[PDB]
Swiss-Prot record, chains A, B:
InterPro entries: Csc1-like, CSC1/OSCA1-like_7TM, CSC1/OSCA1-like_cyt, Csc1/OSCA1-like_N. Pfam families: PHM7_cyt, RSN1_7TM, RSN1_TM. It is found in: Cell membrane. One of its GO terms (molecular function) is monoatomic cation channel activity. This is Hyperosmolality-gated Ca2+ permeable channel 1.1. Belongs to the CSC1 (TC 1.A.17) family. It comes from Arabidopsis thaliana. Homodimer. GO terms for biological process: cellular hyperosmotic response; protein tetramerization; regulation of calcium ion import; response to osmotic stress. Keywords: Calcium, Cell membrane, Glycoprotein, Ion channel, Ion transport, Membrane, Transmembrane, Transmembrane helix, Transport. Acts as a hyperosmolarity-gated non-selective cation channel that permeates Ca(2+) ions. Shows the following permeability sequence: K(+) > Ba(2+) = Ca(2+) > Na(+) = Mg(2+) = Cs(+). Mechanosensitive ion channel that converts mechanical stimuli into a flow of ions: activated in response to membrane stretch and poke. Residues 304-309, 633-635 are annotated as: Cytoplasmic region required for homodimerization. Changing N123Q: No effect on the molecular weight of OSCA1 when overexpressed in a heterologous system.
């Protein structure tokens, strides 16, 4: 646990990262791996077939050029593209996500210098002075970044080309009327309440079943497509037991190929059936619509205005890009939304507290099944749970009912933050023997709960240092290697490829993953902020994470990741608020570290710090936050007038009419 | 402190109230007192000169008819006018203020029955069950009243005649431009951002000096007007030392009459001067304007929409009625607003905590000056402070910068609530020896502050019982007597009357006084809710207050009080929230009363109660509150269309143009 010991593990992790980088150098040279290493370039059409032409040499024939810049040159090259160019290459979302890593450096580097020039030499009022300076600097940098990101969002929103969401609102909870259809209600309402600028509307329909049937058809057509064209005739008719799939030659359904062709045909028959009972029924039509307006100004008005005396009916909000719309959740009743949120809130309480016990349950189950038909339960335990955490949290957000992928990712990121506040930091080691602490809290005569818990849950430094070195050093290095997407496309272009040209593209690497990546940055913001006034040891390792992550993610944003939506940095208020939470928690923990005994000339200052931080947060929520939630009417009018001058005769009707039909 | 003792004081206070009612019976018979007893009727024009003709008999000649209904008949007569008729007679504000007393009965009567059928007989899980039922009932009644008051407000706003505020917004923080005047900036902005419906605007000017000069002129013209026309020629040239006024024949300024005529003339000369340097200067013009629109729908849009990328500039809010506008605060810079609020927040901390010490200071001062030139310091101490509390709190709200009398009254009512939470209830007796408790808190090694304070600050029952009987029984009875307004007009129609007809009207009794009356109701809501699950003794006395206050205030609303503004019950969210606070405090105190020792099958329920209450509050803030803050666009459009059909050719321009000029 000494500097020496920690430094040994540091060197090991630096080497692990370097090994990853070396493999990356080799794999990125392979012409057949370029599809999954330069995906963004192909998605942009700037690069051609994989290796600028594809299928060439330069692979294992020359391995990787023996040097130092083989596994290092990609770093300065990632830092070469200007930010403006990356805004048009990747998007504003990705550029401001990168700005969070730069913010971490802009905040922690100066405060690391301060903590290393005060604490370690002079080793108390120094702690409180440091705390103050740290919070002042953090807030100053947060305000400057709130301003820059807001100005970037506004510049982006103004220079953006026509988007259907700029003219549309999602009206929800349209009150049911026994004499009129949802469509008629909507049309009439917006023709009398927004007469001057109402253009068109698109009622939301529950086409979830039809969509799932179409998705099932495609899945089944591609299930045994590998087997269908393996050798045709009668191939390996595998039987993945119908309960979980995968498997293969395990159940009893041999039949034929292409997932037993008749099955694909019966799914097609059900698709036809559903199509009939979804277009001609008027019961699939949900109490919601997508109302478009002739001007962006009018849509802004509608989005930021109450329409009726019942503020829970005719709820109008800025619509999301048609590609950001999560259609399954647009068919969930509004009343249900609130109940689902509550159910998922308590399910999360359970997931963030009583989760080690179910993990131990499955661990014990795995020991039993391990004996039956070398093992040592490696890779399971909680590692697998941490890989599934983002997905579990995402399905929880989908249950809650968010109708935009952007918002779902933002909700999952907020949940992951709370998970990390509890299970990585305050409350990880306090969770002794499952709910033993909770049993004592239930049988506690007085209110000793905070006492017991707080006292023994502040966590340690050297242990956290190893976490940064494993998850934030070698972890971000593994990201550059893109192992799983490579494997996926390898076992797809060799398996179920059968494409006429380039239709079977499993090269898609998804996006940055705000629901996972941001929680990581925020956990290191938390760690670095809480420990800063106490120990200056966490800061150096946290800073290496920020620098490495900046470069690895910049590379991945320029070369691999493709944005699945464009929210124009709408998530920044969330980011800001989580660093504000980190700050407040830091000051609260310092109050505890320096409150017992101490002095009466310490508490007045350690109580002013949280207040100042909350006041700054409120100032920032009133100065910069509105830019991310409401479109200013002057900006909307400016865009409208300029567009109507450049294009005097645009038929917005056609463009906005079919924009919000369910993709099915 | 026994039932007997408390009942003796009860009888005394019942008799005091009856004595007040008896004097009221006599005084309301006097034909010369009718001006200040039936003021509303004269303000409405329904009644003529004082005693339906004025100056008659029926005074002391027959005294008061010896009976029982002399001092009792006014009660059923006050309960005779229907609520709808009172909405058009007095206003919605006054009708919903009366509804708070009825709400108190609707909440406390059923819960008094429950507490008297459970606690007293069976005398613990009964306390927690009572608490639950009490909160459920209170919330149910709160929700039902939120609904009724909201529907009443919407019905009122729809049936209201054209009001200038229905088409106007107060734009604040108009960004300074070196090339354009505030007027030009405003006009251009709203002609490009709200082109379709912008009508006119009225820039706010700092005419505070001119207004104060005009007010000074009138004050001086009426100062020694009594003396001017006492006997004319050369009358008693009194000298109120110029530092506080009043006095008379005390300073050195003898001069002449009418406050030394030359002074009135020099104030008139300064009025002329100021008029020049306020109309022709463009530096008096504040960065704010009153923008009117052709439709109420457009003003609603503007009020509930962000106008520019800087959400702190071009701030648009629904304008208040020109009569509700507090013009002095419309000339206070927006930046200053925030600082002033903070300064007044800490001044209030001082007023609600360290206030007994300044009272003791002045008390000790009065002992010294008492000897100099029978005394016993009667009526001073804190009684005088409680009469000045509403005024102090009002001047604090005026400092904060609220530009509407309605909002100033609402702010002062909120402050008075906090004062009462602390100094009437939790923290009154804990304030031992000024700041002795605070000195110990400053030198407290651990966090023993909550412990010490809470333990010894829950207050007692019998003592509170006497408070209800004095302030809520005899207090509301004294209100019916209207002593001070009577005296004022008596010493004005006999003093500085000199009116050609009926111009010197000091019969104006003001309004209900939301800034004072509501805090009282809320203090009894608090007391009755906190004590209910513990003791059922406070409830009966609290219920008598509600009943008596309902009848006395209904009488005063129908006969005396005249509304100075019409907010259409916009204060109800505040009322609701203060009863919600009472509920939460009640549950917190019950947790303390029943948490030490007790059981582990009591805490889970006593922690669910506050959560349920906050959840209900949030539901009510999302369902009913928006009706009080934002005008629904459908309602605005309905009013607009109906009005444009009844009156096809209205020139809203003329009506809305001169509506917002400073009354000077």
């Amino acid at each position: 646990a000494t500097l020496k010991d920690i430094g040994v593990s540091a060197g090991i992790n630096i080497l692990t990262a370097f090994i990853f980088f070396i493999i990356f150098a080799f794999l990125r040279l392979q012409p057949f791996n370029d599809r999954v290493y330069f995906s963004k370039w192909y998605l942009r059409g700037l690069r051609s077939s994989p290796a600028s032409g594809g299928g060439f040499a330069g692979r294992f024939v020359n391995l990787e050029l023996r040097s130092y810049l083989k596994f290092l040159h990609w770093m300065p090259e990632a830092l070469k593209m200007p930010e403006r160019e990356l805004i048009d290459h990747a998007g504003l979302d990705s550029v401001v996500y990168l700005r969070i890593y730069w913010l971490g450096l802009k905040i922690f580097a100066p405060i690391a210098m301060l903590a290393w020039a005060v604490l370690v030499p002079v080793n108390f009022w120094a702690h409180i002075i440091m705390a103050y300076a740290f919070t002042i600097w953090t807030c100053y940098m947060l305000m400057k970044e709130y301003e820059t990101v807001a100005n970037m969002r506004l510049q982006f929103l103004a220079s953006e080309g026509r988007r259907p969401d700029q003219f549309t609102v999602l009206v929800r909870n349209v009150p049911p009327d026994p004499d009129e259809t949802v469509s008629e209600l909507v049309e009439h309402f917006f023709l009398v309440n927004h007469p001057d600028n109402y253009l068109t509307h698109q009622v939301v329909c529950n086409a979830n079943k039809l969509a799932d049937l179409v998705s099932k058809k495609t899945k089944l057509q591609n299930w045994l497509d590998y087997y269908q064209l393996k050798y045709t005739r009668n191939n390996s008719q595998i039987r993945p037991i119908t309960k979980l799939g995968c498997l293969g030659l395990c159940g009893q359904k041999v039949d034929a190929i292409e997932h037993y062709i008749a099955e694909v045909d019966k799914t097609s028959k059900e698709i036809a059936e559903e199509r009939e009972n979804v277009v001609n029924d008027q019961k699939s039509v949900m109490p919601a619509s997508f109302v478009s307006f002739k001007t962006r100004w009018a849509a802004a008005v509608c989005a930021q205005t109450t329409q009726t005396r019942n503020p829970t009916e005719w709820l109008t909000e800025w619509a999301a890009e048609p590609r950001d719309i999560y259609w399954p959740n647009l068919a969930i009743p509004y009343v249900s939304l609130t109940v689902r949120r509550l159910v998922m809130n308590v399910a999360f309480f359970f997931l963030t507290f009583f989760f080690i016990i179910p993990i131990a349950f499955v661990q014990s189950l795995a020991t039993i099944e391990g004996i039956e038909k070398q093992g040592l339960l490696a890779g399971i335990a909680l590692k697998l749970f941490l890989i599934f955490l983002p997905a579990i949290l995402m399905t929880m957000s989908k249950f809650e009912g968010f109708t935009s992928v952007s918002f779902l990712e933002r909700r999952s990121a907020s949940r992951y933050y709370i998970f990390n506040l509890v299970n990585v930091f305050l409350g990880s080691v306090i969770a002794g023997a499952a709910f033993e602490q909770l049993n004592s809290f239930l049988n506690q005569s007085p209110n000793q709960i905070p006492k017991t818990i707080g006292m023994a849950i502040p966590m340690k430094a050297t242990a956290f240092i190893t976490y940064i070195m494993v998850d934030g050093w070698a972890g971000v290095a593994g990201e550059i290697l893109m192992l799983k997407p490579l494997i996926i496309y390898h076992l797809k272009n060799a398996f179920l490829v059968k494409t006429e040209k380039d239709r079977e593209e499993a090269m898609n690497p998804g996006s940055i993953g705000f629901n996972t990546g941001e929680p990581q940055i925020q956990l290191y913001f938390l760690l670095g902020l809480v420990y800063a006034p106490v120990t200056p040891m966490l800061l150096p390792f946290i800073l290496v994470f920020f620098a490495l992550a900046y470069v690895v993610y910049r590379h991945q944003i320029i070369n691999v990741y493709n944005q699945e939506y464009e929210s124009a940095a709408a998530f920044w208020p969330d980011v800001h608020g989580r660093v504000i939470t980190a700050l407040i928690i830091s000051q609260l923990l310092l109050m505890g570290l320096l409150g017992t005994k101490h002095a009466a000339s310490a508490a007045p200052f350690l109580i002013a710090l949280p207040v100042i931080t909350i006041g700054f947060h409120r100032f920032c929520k009133g100065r910069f936050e509105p830019a991310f939630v409401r479109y200013p009417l002057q900006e909307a009018m400016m865009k409208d007038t300029l567009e109507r001058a450049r294009e005097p005769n645009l038929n917005l009707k056609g463009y906005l009419q079919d924009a919000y039909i369910h993709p099915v």
